[PDB]
Amino acid sequence: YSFSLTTFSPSGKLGQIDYALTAVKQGVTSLGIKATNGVVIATEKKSSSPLAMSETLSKVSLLTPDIGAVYSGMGPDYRVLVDKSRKVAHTSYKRIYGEYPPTKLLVSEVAKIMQEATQSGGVRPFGVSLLIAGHDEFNGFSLYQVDPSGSYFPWKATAIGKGSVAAKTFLEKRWNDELELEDAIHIALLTLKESVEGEFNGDTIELAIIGDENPDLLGYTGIPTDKGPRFRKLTSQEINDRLEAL
Amino acid sequence: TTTLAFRFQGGIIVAVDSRATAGNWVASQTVKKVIEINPFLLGTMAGGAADCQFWETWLGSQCRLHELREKERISVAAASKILSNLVYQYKGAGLSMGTMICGYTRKEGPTIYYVDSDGTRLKGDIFCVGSGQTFAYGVLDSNYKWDLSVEDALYLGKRSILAAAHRDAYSGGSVNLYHVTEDGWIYHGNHDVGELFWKVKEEEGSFNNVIG
Amino acid sequence: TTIVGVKFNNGVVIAADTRSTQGPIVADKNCAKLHRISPKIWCAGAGTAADTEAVTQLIGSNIELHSLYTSREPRVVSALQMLKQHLFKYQGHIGAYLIVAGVDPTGSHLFSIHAHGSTDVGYYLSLGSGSLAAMAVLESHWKQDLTKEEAIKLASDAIQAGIWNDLGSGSNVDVCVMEIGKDAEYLRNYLTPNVREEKQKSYKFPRGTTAVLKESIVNI
Amino acid sequence: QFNPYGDNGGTILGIAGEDFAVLAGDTRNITDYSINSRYEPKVFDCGDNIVMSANGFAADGDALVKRFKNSVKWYHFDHNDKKLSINSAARNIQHLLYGKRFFPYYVHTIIAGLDEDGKGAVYSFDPVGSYEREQCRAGGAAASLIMPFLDNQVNFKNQYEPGTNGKVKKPLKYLSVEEVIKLVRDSFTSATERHIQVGDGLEILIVTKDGVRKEFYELKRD
Amino acid sequence: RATSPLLESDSIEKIVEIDRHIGCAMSGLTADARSMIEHARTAAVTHNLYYD
Amino acid sequence: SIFSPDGHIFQVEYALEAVKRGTCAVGVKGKNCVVLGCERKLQDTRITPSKVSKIDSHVVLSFSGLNADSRILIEKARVEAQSHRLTLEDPVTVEYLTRYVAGVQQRYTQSGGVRPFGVSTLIAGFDPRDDEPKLYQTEPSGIYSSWSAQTIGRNSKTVREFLEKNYDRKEPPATVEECVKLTVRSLLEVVNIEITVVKPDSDIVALSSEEINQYVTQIE
Amino acid sequence: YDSRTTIFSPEGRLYQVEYALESISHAGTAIGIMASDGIVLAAERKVTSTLLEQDTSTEKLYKLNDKIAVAVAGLTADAEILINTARIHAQNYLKTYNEDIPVEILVRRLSDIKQGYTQHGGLRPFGVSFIYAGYDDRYGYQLYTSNPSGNYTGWKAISVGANTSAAQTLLQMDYKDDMKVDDAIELALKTLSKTTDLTYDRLEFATIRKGANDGEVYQKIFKPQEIKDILVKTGIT
Amino acid sequence: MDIILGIRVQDSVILASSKAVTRGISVLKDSDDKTRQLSPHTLMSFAGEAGDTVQFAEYIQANIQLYSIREDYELSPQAVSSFVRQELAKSIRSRRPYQVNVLIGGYDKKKNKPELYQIDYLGTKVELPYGAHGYSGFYTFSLLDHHYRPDMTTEEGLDLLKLCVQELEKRMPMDFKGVIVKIVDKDGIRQVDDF
Amino acid sequence: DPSSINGGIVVAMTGKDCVAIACDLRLGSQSLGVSNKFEKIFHYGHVFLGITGLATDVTTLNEMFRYKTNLYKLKEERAIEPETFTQLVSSSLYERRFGPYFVGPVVAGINSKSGKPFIAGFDLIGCIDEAKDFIVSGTASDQLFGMCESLYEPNLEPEDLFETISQALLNAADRDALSGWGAVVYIIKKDEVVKRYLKMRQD
Ligand SMILES: CC(C)C[C@@H](C=O)NC(=O)[C@H](CC(C)C)NC(=O)[C@H](CC(C)C)NC(=O)OCc1ccccc1
Ligand SMILES: [Mg+2]
Ligand SMILES: [Mg+2]
Ligand SMILES: [Mg+2]
Ligand SMILES: [Mg+2]
Ligand SMILES: [Mg+2]
Ligand SMILES: [Mg+2]
16 A cells, blocks of 8 residues: 555546545535635534534634634544644744744645645545635735645635535625625625524534634733734624524 | 885886784784785785785775676776775774785786775875885885886895884884786795895895894 | 742742843843743743753643643643653753743642753742742742732742842843733733943944945845 | 673694694683683684684683684585685684674684695684684783794794804704694693693694594693 | 677677686576676675685 | 566566657767767757767767656766766776666666666767777666667667668778768658767767758758 | 556556646646747636635746746646745755756756656656746756656747647747747737636736846746736737 | 965966875875866865865765766856865764865856865865965965965966965975966866976 | 854844944954955845854855745745744754854844844854844954943934944954954845945954
C-alpha cells in the first residue's frame, strides 16, 4: 500500500476524489454568509438518537480566535482535520510570528493537508468539505470552501451538502453586498429552514459568527492592546430568540 | 627513519633506511620501507609502521582494481591521490604517515608525490622524509645535480641515507636502493650500515668525526 | 530580577520588578516579566531571559491546543507537568526559573519551578537575584487568609525589597491578580517609584553640528 | 575515570630453525605486584601447524587468539579444509589488529610455523598490525633483556672470526632444535633473574612437519 | 555477433579478466554481467589484501 | 511478471518500445571529427533545450525516446565527469563515460519501484590528448557499443540501411563538411534538423539553422 | 495495470502520465504570449457562480518571485504544492549566489520534480500544466510550459487546458515575430474569446514588462476592474 | 606562514601567492602554486590548514565547472564568491571545518570590471581594492593605503606588488621562497613569468 | 569571544513620526582593521535591521532574513511589519539556542498601518528588548548606553534626531578600539528615507 490509492482513470478523472465529493453531497446541509461587518456559518444538528446529547458534539469549530469552520460529509474526518488545523496554526505560524495566521493562509494549510491525502500512498481522501469563516487585520472578513481535492474558493455566500442546490439558489436571491451581520444571520436561518426536515430550534441548529472583537471573552484585563476574539458561537437560547421573531 | 626520492637525468632514485623504533628501543633493523605496488610504481613509508604498511598495501589493491576496470595501469598522480583522499577522510583521527609515491607512465614521465596524513600532496623533484630527513637533505642537496650519471645518483642516494643513519638516533639498519626508469623500477640491493659505513669512510676519507 | 507569588483567600497574586540586565548594565528599565500561559494562568521568570520567554510560549501554545482538544479550561497542574518534563529532559540547560500562578476549575494554585525540573508548592514564594530580600518581607508579613488587597500589598512590598536592596532588580512593580470566578487582572506598572528626575539641560544639538560626507535618498 | 587497559607481564620468545620453529612463553600472570597465576598458558596451538602468543594485556590477548582461531575455522569452512599458510595467517592477523587501530589490542603478537617450503617461520606484530617475518623475536616484559642476547647468539651479531682483524664476520648458521631449546631455556632463566614479572614456568611449543609438540620447564617462583 | 556492419566489433567485450589467474566469458543479457564482474574483481583483490 | 518464459525482461523490452517512438538521432565518425544530427513550430528555440548536450568540454550526449528521462542521465554524467577530473586529475575517456551512463541505465532495470530509462543515447567526442574520433551507443538495458556511424529512434532502421551503403570504413568522410553532409543526408531519408560538430581538443560547435539550410537545399 | 504509475505499458507508454494529461485538457484555458518588450499571461476561470468572491483570490496565476510568474491548468491544489517548492528554490538560489534565479533553471527543477514521479515511487503524478512567464538578464523575456511528463519547452506563444488546439490555431494565425506587449494582450483576449465554452469575472490576467520608469521589470497581477477596462478598450465589451 | 595578496586595479585583478611549503624545520618545496582556476575569468588563491586548502579549493572548482557545463554560462565573480562564502559559513559550524582563507580575483565580463574578494574560513567576506591573508596584511595594508591609486594600469599594480613583496622579504620572519603572480582580466587568467 | 573579533556597533532611536538607525563601517580582525565599508544595516521592505557581532553571521542572518521576508511577502501578499519581523528574528535566533549566531540584532521601522515608530533589540539567542526610546548594540554598547541616556529626549523632529543619534554613535565609537572607521545614518519617516555617511576620526 505504498502507492497512491487515488489514481487517474482514462477520462482523466480521479475517482477517489469524486467519490469523496459524493460523500460530501450526501452530508447534512451547512452554509456560510459573508456580511459587511461579519460572516456567519451554520449547519443542522441531526441527532442520530434522541438518547444522544448533541451538545456534547460540535460541528462548528473555533480554529483561531478569529477563524471558525463547519462541514458537510464525514464527521470523523472533520474532527481530525480540526485537530490538525489548530496545531498547524501554532506550529507553522503563531510560534514563528507570535500572531495567528490570516484566514486565507490557514485555509491554505488545511488545503495542503487534504491535497496530501489524495496523493500519498496507502490513504483515501478526506470525505468532507469545509466552510471556513475568518477575519484578519489586512484582509478583513472572508469565507472559503475547501474540497476533498484540496481546492478552495472564496465565497460571498454558499451552501454544501444535501440541500445545497436549493440553498445556493435561495442565497443567490437574498444576498447583496450591504448585508449587516444581523441580516446574514436572519438569511442563514431562513435558508437552513428549507433543508431542515424534522425539528427546527436552537437545539438542532448550530450557528457561529465572526464579527466584532469580544473583550468579555478574553479572560483577562490589563493589556488594552489585546483584542478580544472575533469568533462567537450562538447559544441555543440566542438562536431560539431569533426564531420566534423570525 | 629516513626516506628519499629524487628525479634526475636518468630517472628516479629511491633510498630508505630499515630501522623501526619504540621509544628509544630499536625494535628492528630489517624493516622493508618500500612497497612495490606494480612494476612501475613504488611507495615509501615513514611515520607509523602499521599506518604505512596497512594503507600502502591497501593502495596497491585500489591500483590493481583500477587496472582491471580501465585496462591500463593507474597514473602516479591518481595513485597518490587515492592515498591522499583516504588519509584526508581520517584527518584528526591520529594517523601518522609521511609517504612518497614514485613511478613512471608515458603521460607523466618519472614522477614523485609526497603524501602525508595531514592531507598534504605535493609533486616535486626532491623529497626527504622521516626523523632523519634533514641529514639526508644536507648531503643530497650539497651534491645533487640533474646530470648525475645513474651510478653517481644511486651512490648519492645511498650516501644520503647513510648520513642520516649515522646522525639520527632513530635511523639505521641498512639502505634499500631503487632506480626507476621509463621501463619501471629496478632493485639495487640491501646495504647493511654495519659494513657500509666503514667501507665509505675508507673509500671516501669522510666521517672524520669518528674514531677509526 | 525579583518575582513573588502570594495566595489569598480567593485566588493568587503574582508580581515582578521591571529591570533586565546585560551584566552590570540595564538594557531595559521598564521590561515585562509577567507572562500569560493562558488567560487565567500567568508566570514570572528569572534566569536566562530567552529560555524563560521561549518555554513560556511553548507551553502556552500547547496548553491552548490541549484546552481546545479536551474542550476544558487549562489547568495550572498541566502547565506544571509540561514545563518540568521539558526542563528535565534538557537537564538544566534551559535556564528557566519560574513562578507559575493561576485559577482553573479545580481552584487556585501557586508553584515554583527550577531549570533542572524540580517544582515546589506553597502559599508564598520568591525567585531571582532579589528573592532573599523579598522572602525576608514575606517571612515577616505573611499570614493565612489574606484578602486580595492584602496579598497585593504584601507581594508589592516584597518586590520593593528587591528593587531597593538587590542590584539585580529595580524600577517598577507589575502585578497580576488571578481571582477565582473572575477575569485575571493584570496591573502593568502598578507601582512606578523610580522616575528619572528632570535633567539639568537639554542636549539637543544645533542643526548642522554633525559633519556629513555624503547624503542620498533610499527607496523602499 | 575508567582505564580499559591492564598489564599482565609475561614474556615470549620465537626462534625459527631450518625445518622447525619454536614459540616459548612463561606461565606466570601478574597484576602490579601480585601473582594471579603461576600457570596460565599463553602460547597456543591454533591448528594448521600455527602457534601463537599475544602478550601484554591478557584480556586483549585472549580475545585476539580467540578471533584468530575462529578465523581458521571459517577459512576451513570456506575452502574445504585448505591449510592456512603461515604468511596468510600473518596478513590476516594484520587485519584483525588494524581493525581496532583506534582502540587497539594492547599486545605483542608472535606466531611461528612452517612456510610453503617447510622452513621455520616467525612473524612479529606491533599492537596495530605492523608485521615482518623474522628469524628470532622476544616480546613482552623482558624482551629488552632477551632480544640483544638473541641478536648475539642466534645471529652471531658482533662476533668476528679471530685472527682476521675484525674483518670477517662469524658466518650465519642454522641452529638445531637442541641448540635452540638451550638458548630458550637460558634466555628465560636470565629473564627470571632480572625481571620481577617473569618466573614460575616455561612452556615451549615446537613445530615441525609432523606437528606441534610441547615442553614445560619450571622457573624460579620468587 | 555484430548486429550490423557499422558496429565496431572491437568494442564487443564478452570475455573479461577477473584477476591474473582468472578470466571469464559471459552470455545472455550481458548488461547484467556488470555487477558480477565488479563483485568478482573485488572478491579476488580483497582476498589477496586479507590473506596474501 | 519480470521475465517472460523465453527470458526477456518485460519492462526493459517496453523501454525499447519507448525509444522507437522517439525522434530520430544519428551520429557519424569522420576522419578527424564526429557529427551528431537530430530531428524535430510556434515555439522559441533559442531557450528551448537542445537534443545534444555537452557533458564535459570534449564529450557530448544525444538521445532518442522519453525526453524527460534523458535529463537525469545528462545530469548524472556531468557530475561524474567532474568527479573524474577531481579524483583522477584527467577528464573522462568517451568510453569511460559511456560505461558510466550505461551502468546507470542497467541499474534502473534491477532496482525495486524504479522504471528503466526510456532512452537510448549517442555519446561522442575525443579522449584527452587523442584525435581518434569516438562514438558509442547505449540502450535502456545498459548494453553499450562502439559504432562507425549509428542511428536511434523512429525510422532508425531506414537511416541505418542508408549509412551501411553510404559509409565506408575504408574511407571515412575526410572532412568535417563531408561528415556533416552525410549526416544531413541520412536524416533527409526520414525527415528542421540539428547538427553538432565535435573536433579534437574541445572544438564543439552547433550549426545554426542557416548553415544547415545551406546543406539541405544543396542535397535537394 | 495502468493504475500503477511507474511501469511501462507494452507499447512503452506511461498511462498515468497520459491520463493526467487528459485531466488537464479539461481545465480552464491558460494562454501565454511573448512580446518584444513583455509577456502576457491569461487564464479563464473554470468555476463560475455569481456568489464567487472574484476579487481577492487569483487562483490560476501566481508570482514565484519578483521576476517570474506561472499560469496553472489542472488541480489547483496540486499546483500549490509545486508553486511552493519553486518559490523556495528561487530563494535558495538567491541565498547561494546573491543573484535572481535564471528562469530556465527554476523551470528545469520543477520539470525534474514532475519527471521523478514518472520513474520511481508509486505515487500519482501531479495533475497540472504550467505556463511560466519570466525575465532574466541572460535571455530576457521567456515563456515555458511544463506538463506531468516532466517535459518542458520554450514558446513565443502557447496555451494549455481546454480547447488547446483551437487556441493554438488562432495564435499561429495572428502572431508577429516582434509584437508589442499591448498587442499581445489584445491577441490573448481575442483568442480566449474565440474558445470560451467571456467576462472579467471569469478572467485572471498578468504582465511582465519594462517599467518604463525606468529600465526595470514589473509584474502586474491585474485587478478585476482593470480586467473590465481592458475588456472594453479592445472591443469585447 | 603563507603570503596571499590581491590588488584590484583599473582593468584587472592581480594575485600574488608565496611559493614555499614548510613543515617543521624543512622547506619541502619552493615552487608551489597556491591557486585553482574556477572559471576562465575567475581565480582563487588559498592559505590555511595542511590538506584543507587543496581539498576545499578543488571542491569549489569542481562545482563551478559543473555549473559552467550545465548552464553553458560563466557565473559572475560576485556569484562565485557568494557560493564560496556560504560553503565556508556551513563549514565553520560543521563537524569538521575547513581552515582555509581565500582570495578571489575575477573579471566580470558583463559589468566589465575587476573584482577582488577576501573571504576567511569563518565565511567573512568583503570586496576590496586590495586584500591579504595571514601576517602579511600587517605590512601590506598600510603600504597600499599609501601607494595604491584607483586609476592604475596593470603594470602599476605589478609595481605595487613588487613593493609589497620587497617589504615582506625584508620584515617577515620566514623565508616564503618568493611569489607567483597571476593576472585576471577580460581575456582571462595568465601568469607573469618575469616576476 | 566571537562577538568581539570583528568589532562594530549599531544604535537605533525613536523620534516624532520617525525612527533612526545607525552603524559604524569597521570590519577588523582583532587589532587589524580590514574593511572600511562594512555596513551593518539592512532592509526588507520598510523594515530595517542592524546587526553587530561576528561578521560572517551578520552576513548569514541578512541572507536568511531576506529569504524569509521574501517568502512572507509572496504568501501574505503584503510586506512584513516591524512588530512581526521582530518576533521572526527572535524565533529564528532561538532555533539555534545551543549553537547560536554570535550577533546583536536591532530592528527599526514604522508600521505601515499605525504609522507608529518601532524599535527592538535582541540578545544572541533571541531575547527581545522591547524598549522604545533607544536600542544599542556592539563592542561599544557601554559607551552607547551612556551617550543615549545623556543626549536622548523623546519626540525629536527628524532633523534633530539626526544630530542626536549621530553624536551618540560618533562619541561612543571614539572611545572604542574595535568600532568606528566611518558611519552611516538612516532617518526613516513614512514617505522618505535618507541615508547619510558621517565624517569621523579614522584612527
Ligand atoms: C615505516 C616505519 C617502520 C618507519 C619508522 C620511522 O619512521 N617508524 C617507526 O619506527 C615507529 C616510530 C616512529 C613513529 C617514531 N614505530 C612504530 O610504528 C611501531 C612498530 C614497530 C615497533 C614494529 N609501533 C608503535 O610505535 O607503537 C604502536 C601502538 C599503538 C597503540 C598502543 C600501543 C602501541
Ligand atoms: Mg596461503
Ligand atoms: Mg622474577
Ligand atoms: Mg617475589
Ligand atoms: Mg556588547
Ligand atoms: Mg573607535
Ligand atoms: Mg587606530
